[PDB]
Write an enzyme that holds these catalytic residues in place. Sequence first.
Site: not given
Ligand SMILES: Nc1nc2c(ncn2[C@@H]2O[C@H](COP(=O)(O)OP(=O)(O)OP(=O)(O)O)[C@@H](O)[C@H]2O)c(=O)[nH]1
Ligand SMILES: [Mg+2]
Lengths: 39, 48, 50, 429, 90, 82, 48, 52, 52, 439, 439
Positions: K11, K71, K144-145, K179, K206, K228, K254
């Site tokens: 995500q 997902e 996770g992913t 998170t 973040n 982002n 480089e």
């Molecule tokens: N910079 C940035 N970080 C994000 C953003 N969305 C989620 N994150 C990071 O994702 C972390 C949480 O991980 P997850 O909710 O599991 O999202 P994921 O790493 O893609 O893994 P899953 O969603 O579980 O498949 C947070 O601590 C954020 O640092 C975003 O839009 N911008």
């Molecule tokens: Mg996800």
Amino acid sequence: FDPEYPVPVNQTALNASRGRNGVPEGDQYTIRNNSTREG
Amino acid sequence: PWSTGLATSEARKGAGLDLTENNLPSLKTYRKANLTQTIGAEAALSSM
Amino acid sequence: EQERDRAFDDRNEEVNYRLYEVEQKVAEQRRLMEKNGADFNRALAEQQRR
Amino acid sequence: REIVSCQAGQCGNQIGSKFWEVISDEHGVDPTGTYQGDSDLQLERINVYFDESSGGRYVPRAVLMDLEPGTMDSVRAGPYGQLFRPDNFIFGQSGAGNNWAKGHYTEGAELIDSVLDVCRKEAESCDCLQGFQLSHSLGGGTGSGMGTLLISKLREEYPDRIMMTFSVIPSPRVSDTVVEPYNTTLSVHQLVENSDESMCIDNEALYDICFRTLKLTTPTFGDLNHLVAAVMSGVTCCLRFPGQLNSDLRKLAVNLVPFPRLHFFMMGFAPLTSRGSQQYRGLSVAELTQQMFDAKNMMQAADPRHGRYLTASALFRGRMSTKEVDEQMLNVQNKNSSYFIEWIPNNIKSSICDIPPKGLKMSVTFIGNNTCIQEMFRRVGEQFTGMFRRKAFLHWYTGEGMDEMEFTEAESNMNDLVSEYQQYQDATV
Amino acid sequence: SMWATMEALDRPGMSKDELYMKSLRQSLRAKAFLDSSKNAGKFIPDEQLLSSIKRRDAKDLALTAELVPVRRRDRLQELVLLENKHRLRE
Amino acid sequence: KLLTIPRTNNYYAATGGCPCVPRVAAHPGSWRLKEGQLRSSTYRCGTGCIKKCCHHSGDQYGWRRGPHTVLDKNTAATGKCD
Amino acid sequence: KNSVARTQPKKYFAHAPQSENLPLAIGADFHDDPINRSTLRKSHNLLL
Amino acid sequence: GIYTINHEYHHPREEVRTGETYTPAEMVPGQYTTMYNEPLQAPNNVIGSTRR
Amino acid sequence: TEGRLETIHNLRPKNWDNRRHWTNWHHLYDCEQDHITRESAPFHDLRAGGQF
Amino acid sequence: MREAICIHIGQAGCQVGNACWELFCLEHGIQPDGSMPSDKCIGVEDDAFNTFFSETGAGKHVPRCLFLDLEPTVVDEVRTGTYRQLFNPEQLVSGKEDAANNYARGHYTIGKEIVDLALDRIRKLADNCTGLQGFMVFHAVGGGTGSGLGALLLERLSVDYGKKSKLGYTVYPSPQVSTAVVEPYNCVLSTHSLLEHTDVATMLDNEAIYDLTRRSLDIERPSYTNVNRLIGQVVSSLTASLRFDGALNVDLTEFQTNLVPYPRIHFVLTSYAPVVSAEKAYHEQLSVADITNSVFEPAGMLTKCDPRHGKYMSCCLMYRGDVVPKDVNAAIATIKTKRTIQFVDWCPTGFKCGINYQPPTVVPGGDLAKVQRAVCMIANSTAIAEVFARIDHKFDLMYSKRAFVHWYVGEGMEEGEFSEAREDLAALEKDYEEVGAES
Amino acid sequence: MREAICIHIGQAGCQVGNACWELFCLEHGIQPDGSMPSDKCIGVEDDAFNTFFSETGAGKHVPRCLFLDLEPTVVDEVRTGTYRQLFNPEQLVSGKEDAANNYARGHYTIGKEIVDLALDRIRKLADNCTGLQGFMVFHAVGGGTGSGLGALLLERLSVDYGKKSKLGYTVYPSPQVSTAVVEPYNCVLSTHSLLEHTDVATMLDNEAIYDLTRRSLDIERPSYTNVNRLIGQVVSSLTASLRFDGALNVDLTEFQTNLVPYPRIHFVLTSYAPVVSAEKAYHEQLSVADITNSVFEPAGMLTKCDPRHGKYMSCCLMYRGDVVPKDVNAAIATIKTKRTIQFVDWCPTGFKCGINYQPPTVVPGGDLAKVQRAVCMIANSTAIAEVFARIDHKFDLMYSKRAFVHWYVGEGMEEGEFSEAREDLAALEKDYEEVGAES
Ligand SMILES: Nc1nc2c(ncn2[C@@H]2O[C@H](COP(=O)(O)OP(=O)(O)OP(=O)(O)O)[C@@H](O)[C@H]2O)c(=O)[nH]1
Ligand SMILES: [Mg+2]
Ligand SMILES: Nc1nc2c(ncn2[C@@H]2O[C@H](COP(=O)(O)OP(=O)(O)OP(=O)(O)O)[C@@H](O)[C@H]2O)c(=O)[nH]1
Ligand SMILES: Nc1nc2c(ncn2[C@@H]2O[C@H](COP(=O)(O)OP(=O)(O)O)[C@@H](O)[C@H]2O)c(=O)[nH]1
Ligand SMILES: [Mg+2]
Ligand SMILES: [Zn+2]
């Protein structure tokens, strides 16, 4: 294919080694020349 | 001057000078070279 | 001699650019053909959705 | 001096179609056959390739051979298709099926009667026949089998004529059949003893010429075959047009073949340059020599730096001078003498023809008896050994009546030819 | 056979897919040997067997010459037995 | 070479298993179905740290074997070819 | 054994140097380009 | 593995013209003549042919 | 001018100064050096003035 | 000249032929009724249609094909369909009782009494044809008349037509899904004729065709119609070389001899690309290299077998459209480098190339996007032994208990026939393995 | 040429990639439909988009991107969002069930049912690029992913592409803002991939971005969209050298060579300046020296790690706009002069500079403001060991009594994986301190 082989010989060196200096006596197609030395 | 040699001081080509085939220094360009067939079979044809 | 060389060079260059023109014309025809094919494919996509 | 053309197989017929394209252009012949020349010279030697028809037109002395009528029909529908005489097209109900055995013993055997009828018919019509020029592909069935049958069985009737063969050789990179080794081996151990001279073209080298030199974005078989048609015309340019230093097929064979078995040549054409790169280059014999002796200009996918030159011949066309044309040959021989054979002094024979190809100030066709020609033979012989060792694709050739010993005979002859090409390459004085 | 080859190549830890690969290789090598030997008469040149023929001939000639003497060679060996003295003193 | 080797009934008779695809009590398009039907999904190179002519793989690509066992009598020892 | 009424079709190749008043140089074979060919369908020309 | 160049930066010149109408036979100067009738070299003459 | 009699380095083809010449192989003349240096033609842009 | 007589056996063959003819008529400009426009004296200016259609004594075009079914539903649907006037009233042979998925019924009882009538119709077709290239058979080995009657028809064609090429396109039981229980028996028994009395046989399994449609054509619920449309596209790609102008002409004998190294080894695996939906098509630059890579990838494969598990022996690539030797050779050179695909040591060449200038056509209601170029592979590879192993292992499981053998006995065959079929399939796997072995 | 492939994982990866690709489209004048209607400033068939966009037969510019998430929420909303036509229906693939912040689940169970298709799509993308510079993988290791499937994808890409460049834009768990609770486990377990199969690992945590935006952009409420957008600005600053012309052009390898001193010392912090608001921007003269000083300050930095606790090892500066090299030379001189930031003794130069002509593109409606010049620093420094020494401390506190380990061990991952990851991370702090130690 090796471009160097066959190696181009040295005819001057070959004549020097073989002793091919001349025929002072003369042959069927040569001439009795007194100037030539060492054969 | 040669083609590879310098043409800096080479004579300029005159405006009236003709640099084409008709001005090639050949027998056909020679003025008193009578190329037209005065006598012969081709002369007989030209007389037709 | 130099004049003959230059004459051939100029005529060859002109003919070469005419050849380039016709080659670009056929290339643009091919490009237009594949543009039309892509438009057909898009229209078929909307038709399949419909 | 008369040369009778025969086009065998799909490849041979396409190459011949484009060859007659270029020849009709050079001799001022329209697709309808009527003569539209601009000088005496075109008509003065138009008999060499064209038999004069009734109403002031000309008909090519070409025989079209294909068990598949498809390429026949494509040739006929071509822009100059109506130029050819109708009965000269010979075809059968079913094709050779990419089989040398089918093209040489079973399917090509019935039509060979009519093919010899046509070739003999075109033979006496010549005041003094010079030779037979057959264009074909070694990897095919009709072009290889039937073509080599024609090559073998015309020598018996006409032993004193030059037998010239344009063989479009295969390549493992360019493999568009799976029986290339079988077909080309069966063709080559026939061309060895039945061809006065056999020049070879590789589609890999044709593609590479399009890649490097022409730089065409989408070059098709038309552009590809123009490359070989230009050389086919430039070999006999000296026959068809006057020159300062003339030559014919027999003179080319004499100056190019030191030993009769060694008669396989690799060719190149100059000038060749992309349209955008022609402005930086001045067209002269000095550049033509470099273009010939540039290996990327070959129609053989073999590197001349990988062998020595038994002999070479440059058929120059166009108005030039006889001094620097020999100066270039002397310079290249002397300064690449590590790539020219020592015991054959002055390996390059240069002929000059006055009339250049239309649109080019001066051109040249290169014909080289390079010892690197053994590379293709060794590679495809290794492929043939690999296929025959495990008895692959035999049943197609064997069920046509052929004996197992024919392939062994071909392998022996191929290894033998490679053996001369190596033992005269590395020979001392 | 197949079971015999699997028993013979009993190497632990090695992947048994690789076991099947090697067993297949040996079995088909044996089959190819048989097939090639059926028709090797025409393909193999006569010069190849000449080496074995020479070895057998040399062995047979040694076995025969280990017994039979010759008087004509006895004169030669009487001429010999002194040049060797010459060599050792030289 | 482990991909060159054919997946023959002879292979299954010597190996133990059947070319029949494994029927697993699984939902379509799921990780459980993929692990039950393919051997590349559950492949794991070694176990733990190495401390506790290199290693090569290529056997995990294919399909899981069936529950049945291939009798030898259904297999041919020789085949007609050249 | 086909229709006797049918005739040999005429195939028009778009860009040829002869028709365009250009030399037949190497790489100038735009008539052989399949896009420049009126119909890609293949006829039995000899039998018609 | 083969070098290529775009048509935009690899094309013949459009900035050179001679204003000459010529058939391809007359294109190459002296391209239908030999070295015995015309040993020397010289350009042709067509409509609009001038000194260059 | 890749090789030159002009310079000190012998970039000539291997043993060209004593090559297979008509002056030494079956013949033999005291003019061998003169004839090698005279018939080394493309290394004569300077010494010969460019002539053969 | 260059005629090719098409044959359709069983429901699968008949429907595949219907979807092939809706494509051939549209591609060669023949109306579904077959007649010409009233004002035009000749419907089509050229005779490129000659290979598939023969013009009649009214000027209109009848196809050079036969339909053959022991049950009348499909042939009567053809009679009552939109091509009621195109097809000959004969050459559409119908029986009064099907073979009931039974090879014995299709081969020994019902097939023998209709095969001679079918051969009579085929003989009339061959007499009409003057340059017959060969026969183009379409059927499924899993059916009754498709397998047994197709086998008998192929045997009679072989005995009566000499060595004339007999290309076959057959639908095999899928590794996953099947619509019959006796399908392994039918496939095993049909492999007899398909192993001796045909030149090149093409795998056309519905599972891989469904996967193709699902992943590429984006049809969430595809059907036999889409499957047969893809099959017809493959067949048209194979045959178009003799119908349209092309760079490298390829004929039936050409690609049947450049494909098979041994008489027993003639079962080939075929793939077609770029098979993409309309949404897919305008997003990808479908170059020659891309389509070649997609063809060699198992994703574009029409047979549920992974070629990476075997060794390629002979691939015939038929390119259609704006393809060029400038690019096809480059694609071949860069795909030989790839080491997922791999050739037997005794066939280094392994490639045949046939280039045709005519791009593929589009059928109304079809899901095939209009592509500027396409390529179809006909590949003989040792990886095909997998499906044979699966099918005769299912045969062994079904044959250990002598299940369903009573149907074949009641329809007139020996159990020695089952035994010999199993032994010959085992031998087929053995020599597939042998030819896959190195030297 | 100069093509680069962007792979977004999870995500967080998809969210970052959305902003990255909108900013790329705004850079290259490409609409969400994917066309170039008319631009007088653009030359005829000018292609500076080749790095990120590939030309299509439809005239479209398809991104060289691959979106992954186990997902379909973010994937489906992107598929139904603004860039439906820009993005291919493929190349934007999703699973069906999320990894649930389980590294084992995303690396062994759910990641493996989609990694095969991910590699297939990556290969399809790479076949179209003749000058592929490398892969940029955007993910957060705290999920996770992004942890599991990201590690699996990187491990497979290493063997599938050899020595090609890998640039991992990774969002670690920040010291305070974080998170998930199993987030330390995911971060520690995903350390092997980032150590081995990623050539350069850039930090985008973040909390530092939040502090930067609240203190310098003067908006009380930025969001994931804003962070982002900032990350996309950083990525565009990095890739501008290979996209557009510049005085000093630098490529991926480089700056890789100049930034990586030792085989795995490649974890690098990121900074960008001038980050400026609309009201802030048009009152200051943003000099090059000023923006460089703001970059080197630890408040305009995108990674929460104070450089004063470490030694600077190698800094790569990417300047965009009207920057003359003398300004950056004076910036380097004054940076070496100033003492509160210290370089490591064995790296005297320690500085790489790349100047690009085109300035950053403002995105109205977002958060940034138009500026004539900008600079992004990618810095390898020993101060980055602090975040590792904090995350491993959290891992030890969590793992002392086997908390949350049943979830990981029930997904087919051995218990020793945690110990191996902890030991590898410990060796990471160890050799960071070793290289930071004076000679
Ligand atoms: N910079 C940035 N970080 C994000 C953003 N969305 C989620 N994150 C990071 O994702 C972390 C949480 O991980 P997850 O909710 O599991 O999202 P994921 O790493 O893609 O893994 P899953 O969603 O579980 O498949 C947070 O601590 C954020 O640092 C975003 O839009 N911008
Ligand atoms: Mg996800
Ligand atoms: N590709 C394709 N396969 C088909 C089609 N129709 C039937 N099949 C195949 O045929 C099998 C069913 O048996 P059929 O071929 O219909 O049997 P038949 O040839 O009609 O012979 P009988 O069983 O005696 O009626 C299925 O498993 C399919 O694989 C079709 O329209 N397209
Ligand atoms: N140069 C060139 N070669 C061709 C052409 N057509 C076919 N070939 C070559 O011919 C060989 C195959 O010959 P084939 O068509 O089978 O001959 P056939 O069996 O007698 O009809 C291939 O290796 C091709 O490279 C062509 O138009 N130009
Ligand atoms: Mg039925
Ligand atoms: Zn089983």
